[PDB]
Design a binder for this molecule. Structure first.
Ligand SMILES: *[C@@H]1O[C@H](CO)[C@@H](O[C@@H]2O[C@H](CO)[C@@H](O)[C@H](O)[C@H]2NC(C)=O)[C@H](O)[C@H]1NC(C)=O
Ligand SMILES: *[C@@H]1O[C@H](CO)[C@@H](O)[C@H](O)[C@H]1NC(C)=O
Lengths: 49, 49, 49, 48
């Protein structure tokens, strides 16, 4: 949806509500996103450096 | 807020975008304020009776 | 229990009886241990610009 | 002294403070990462 970014993405376990699509850290950044094509839960983690 | 944009609504609005500078200063001035009482506490009250 | 305001007490008042031929010599003693705390270091931190 | 240290929490305030301020500055430093500073976005990938 225009949210360009870079990181390793894997299956999540954090419970999104049926209507939410973003999870934010205390530092105000998106660490979890919902796939729009199919409804699944994912992490967005920066690849190690 | 009072120093930078005293008694003006519009000026108090643009200062909001700069984040937490205003909070940072007020703690810094408070940090030395409490410390001053600690000094005169330390040098004069060596006797309690 | 409630909250009250008052003037602080400079301590427990105690007068001493001076004289030109009076002395006091202790006859007993106690060995008490008192703690003391001092910081010695902080958590090191590095930041990439 | 074992009871004095265990029962009261204010005894170790001096050591606790230096831990706190170090955590405070880092929190504020990363908090400024979300402020626009006068631009139209705080996300450097959005403008690009
Ligand atoms: C000096 O003081 C100590 C205590 O500070 C005295 O020791 C106590 O003596 C009483 C006798 O009435 C005992 O009941 C206590 O059990 C003792 N305390 C301890 C910790 O053993 C001591 O007798 C005093 N000595 C002099 C010469 O005054
Ligand atoms: C995209 O197409 C798939 C079929 O492969 C469908 O299951 C999915 O619901 C479509 N996307 C949306 C947002 O409906």
């Amino acid at each position: 949806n225009g949210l360009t970014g870079t990181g390793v993405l894997t299956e999540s376990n954090k419970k999104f509500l049926p209507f939410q699509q973003f999870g934010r850290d205390i530092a105000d950044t998106t660490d979890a996103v919902r796939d729009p094509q199919t409804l699944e839960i994912l992490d967005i983690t920066p690849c190690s450096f | 807020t009072m120093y930078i944009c005293g008694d003006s609504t519009e000026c108090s609005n643009l200062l909001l975008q700069y984040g937490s500078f205003c909070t940072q200063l007020n703690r810094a001035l408070t940090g030395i304020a409490v410390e001053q009482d600690k000094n005169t506490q330390e040098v004069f009250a060596q006797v309690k009776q | 229990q409630s909250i009250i305001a008052y003037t602080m007490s400079l301590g427990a008042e105690n007068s001493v009886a001076y004289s030109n031929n009076s002395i006091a010599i202790p006859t007993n003693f106690t060995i008490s241990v008192t703690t003391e705390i001092l910081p010695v270091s902080m958590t090191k931190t590095s930041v990439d610009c | 002294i074992q009871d004095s240290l265990s029962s009261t929490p204010s005894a170790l305030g001096k050591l606790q403070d230096v831990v706190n301020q170090n955590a405070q500055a880092l929190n504020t430093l990363v908090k400024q990462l979300s402020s626009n500073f006068g631009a139209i976005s705080s996300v450097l990938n959005d403008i690009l």
